[PDB]
Design a protein around this ligand. Sequence first.
Ligand SMILES: CCCCC[C@H](O)/C=C\[C@H]1[C@H](O)CC(=O)[C@@H]1CCCCCCC(=O)O
Length: 1224
Amino acid sequence: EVKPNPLQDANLCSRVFFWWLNPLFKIGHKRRLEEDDMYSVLPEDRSQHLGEELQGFWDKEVLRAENDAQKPSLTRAIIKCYWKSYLVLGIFTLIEESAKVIQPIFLGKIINYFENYDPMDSVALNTAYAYATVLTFCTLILAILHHLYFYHVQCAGMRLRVAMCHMIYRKALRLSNMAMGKTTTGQIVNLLSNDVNKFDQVTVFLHFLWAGPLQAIAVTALLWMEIGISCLAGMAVLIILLPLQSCFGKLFSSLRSKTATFTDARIRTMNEVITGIRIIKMYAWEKSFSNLITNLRKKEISKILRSSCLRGMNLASFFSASKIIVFVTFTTYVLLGSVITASRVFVAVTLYGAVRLTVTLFFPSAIERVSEAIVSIRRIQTFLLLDEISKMVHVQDFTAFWDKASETPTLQGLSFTVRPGELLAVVGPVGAGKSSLLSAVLGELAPSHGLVSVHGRIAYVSQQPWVFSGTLRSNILFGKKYEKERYEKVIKACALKKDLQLLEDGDLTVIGDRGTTLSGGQKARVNLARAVYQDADIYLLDDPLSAVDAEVSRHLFELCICQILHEKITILVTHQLQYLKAASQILILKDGKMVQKGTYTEFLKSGIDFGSLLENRSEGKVGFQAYKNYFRAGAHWIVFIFLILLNTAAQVAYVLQDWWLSYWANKQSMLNVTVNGGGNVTEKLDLNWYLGIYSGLTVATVLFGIARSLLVFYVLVNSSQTLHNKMFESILKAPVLFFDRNPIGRILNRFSKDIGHLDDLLPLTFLDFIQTLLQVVGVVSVAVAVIPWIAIPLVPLGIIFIFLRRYFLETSRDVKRLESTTRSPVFSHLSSSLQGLWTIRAYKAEERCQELFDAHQDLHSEAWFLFLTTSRWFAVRLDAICAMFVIIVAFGSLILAKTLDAGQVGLALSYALTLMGMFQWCVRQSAEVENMMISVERVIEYTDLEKEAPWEYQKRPPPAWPHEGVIIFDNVNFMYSPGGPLVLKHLTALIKSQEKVGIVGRTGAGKSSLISALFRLSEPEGKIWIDKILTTEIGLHDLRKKMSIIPQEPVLFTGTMRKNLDPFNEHTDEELWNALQEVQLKETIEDLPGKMDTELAESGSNFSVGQRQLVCLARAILRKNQILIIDEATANVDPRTDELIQKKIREKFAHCTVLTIAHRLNTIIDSDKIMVLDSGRLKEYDEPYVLLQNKESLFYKMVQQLGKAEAAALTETAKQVYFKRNYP
Ligand SMILES: CCCCC[C@H](O)/C=C\[C@H]1[C@H](O)CC(=O)[C@@H]1CCCCCCC(=O)O
């Protein structure tokens, strides 16, 4: 019982006020919260019991539905299981709705007291005090019960999600062969990522579904009995607000998809240009790339601006709907010929605002959440309805089918009998049927016809390794007893001493899955150890030495097989004669059947030959520099001043609307009391003038809101576009060191996540936070204007709020980080367990994996529950502060009743009763903005990235230079970092004139050094001369574009063949035709009609290495180059095309300087001079005579180590080329 759980012995007062989160917050504020400081879940929150009971209900419902010939459902089971928990919360929901509906009644009863107020009447004062006390009490119980019910619903949804994921895992752990072949890991991944997550959100409004219409009808009847028939216009407007918002959301989703497809295209293009950034940087093709990038960016930003304007119009309509409804209803009421009373007006506006908020917040969210939950439940149901699964070996023609589509038998002839001590070898080509046997013996294969007889425990060894998360010792011993001799034999017999002397703490270390720290060799070692640790009788393994060195695998065989498995039943699958020495029996598979079984001797003497067969985020608040840069990048100071003035004018108009409304109410009350208070002459107030002023103020505030929203959206979109353009221009001119240090995945993440955030979530959240803050500021200003005494308690309340917000965020950040870092291991372990379902079903040890998944889900639910409790405590505190402020305002207004009219107190109370919920929404929006500002910070930091030398200086190069292309070596080297490593030193030689020259280099001892020094991507150490002219005057484009690239990554470009060969196509088509007919390129493209503008894909979907190298040589000869480089061309090439392109490049490029890099030793013979590089130093750069005459040179030893026949061939070719070169 480690990590005891709080709130288990707490009373009702501490549970209803969340007073048990004091020690956790006190620990999280002083230091960092780890995984050991968390609080365990409740006993009823365990995954095991919930999963078991929900699975029981599911199977009971399935049986009840199948017994009566109907299809089973899971929603009915969920209802029958959680109705006891839902009906209890329904009563609290109904009580809360009734309280929220009756609150405006007491509000109006309080406001009506000031109309007929009498300072000499005690009954009215007592009634007003009682009504104020009742209002305070109902507000308090509302603010409490709302968060209580929210926390209860969140806990119920979390438990439901845990139970559902447990059932899904339990059902996936029992899948059959067809189910395993019909489902992919990513399917279960997105299932457990979306379906169980929607359950935590659908339950929030599952009760609002029915709470909506009842509250709406109640408020409608109240407004009716209050004012009359003038509610019809408001109800009609509220009704027609739904289809307009529906079409607006549909158009917004369409525009969002239209921008998302372009965003995906741009992300793919960016990844393609970044993964091969050296290719574009050398060819100087940045111009056309930037052109197409800005073209796609504009094509996307058009729809982005359209969607932003649509969202701004929708937000302005949602914000002004309350004012429009109020104005329309009041115009309809005045047109009837009645009087205006402050209490009824305030009740009407409050009820209308509440109904609008409800209808436009809960109802559509409820509908969409219920639809998503129903879809998820149906998906889970159709996923769970799949087909589940049901001392010597001896079989009699067990004929089973693996491909049920074709009823033909796939493999026959099963007759095997082995004795204790035999070693059996299996050899076969691809698709021979070894996996069929390994699955039939283990029972994975469905029995159709035959016999399967095995005795004792049996284990399975997959061809690919498998492991779960945790330690290494218990991983190897698999939860069994840590026995001495067994474990010691396995560890000394698995070549683990080197691993342990390279490991941290032996087998007691925490090692993750997915190979984050373990290579293939040691992984095969540990899986072989976990397989042979059980010491079963029959052992079936499938080549566990595929990813390990040969001699060590043979040694491991000699230590394991004849020592531990020498008395066990072993049927091994071999590859070739390297493992046919200790094998007593051998079985071969030919087109699904065998011919005979016997000793390796009987099979060898028969004449059978197998040759035909063969991260440091800124902790705290973001600095103001990022905000200033983000505001100045897309807008100027005048634009910001205009936006601030527009927002201020909009807020002022929104305030003066209600101000003039209350003023007109007070004027009408005064007119009534003067015409009824002993007055004969009547003066009816001019209704047209007041109606005109009201309509003018309404249209003014509506236009102001629309304009400020449009301006905010435009400014934010322009700022995002400018930031993206600046980042692109800074990365395009950045050196290759930035791409070498930061991997491609980091750049992809920074280009995807930050861009998507700034495009979708930043503008809407920012404008919502700004609008809510402006509303709160206006409410506070109205409160201080009505009562000047509210400004006194504003300082302590504000200080307490700021301190509480900081104290809560300091812990919420760490809690969210822990939740994010604990959510992914669950899915990782799920994928790892699903990848090795064969070994799990074979070992019959599903209980261990089930318990591991249950513990992972328990930890995840624990972190989620801690986060929910922290958020609920913060919300309770915020609502309590707001309620206390409302109580203080109401008391201060009721005390000074002699100097306050009815309209003033009514407006003050109506404005104070709107802070509840709105305040916490503003706080959460500010928190989300501060959390998302890290993307803007990273974008600005990437924009402020240092640039290298300019592309071209003021000195224009001549149209003939370079003419010769002579390079002079004068102490030139390369630097990987300023003041870092250095291998090359004192490199000096002399090159020939327009004739072949060669550079030799061995693997691992200067390869990367030579590629860096010869290509010269980064600024190298030393002074470089091209034809004895200084190099520090022009960038990389005009100088390092004359080389031909022969890397492991061929020419990959998407689009028309023009942009692939020459994106600027300065020359006409005739020379291009001639060059492609010279390089034999047309005969391959004759197939498709896209001779010139065909669509090509990346990563070589339909392209081979051959035609790619051919078109590369074609582009090289099109560039009209005088320097040519070839290296490491014998990696992924076919011999035919290899010799073809070799002969072609030999006969063609024979008129100028050819800088051939010598990776092999046969292609260098056609050169003239070679300098031998060793440890970053050359010996001599002369003809091969000095290296073939002197015997102590290293060239001689390479000649021997490359083979005697190859030695004779190379020396023969050398003598030949020397004889044709000296005396022609
Ligand atoms: C009087 C309402 C009490 C609850 C808080 C409510 O959210 C009010 C605030 C509005 C804000 O003024 C505009 C807006 O969008 C808020 C509502 C947004 C959604 C609130 C529910 C939570 C959710 O949507 O996940």
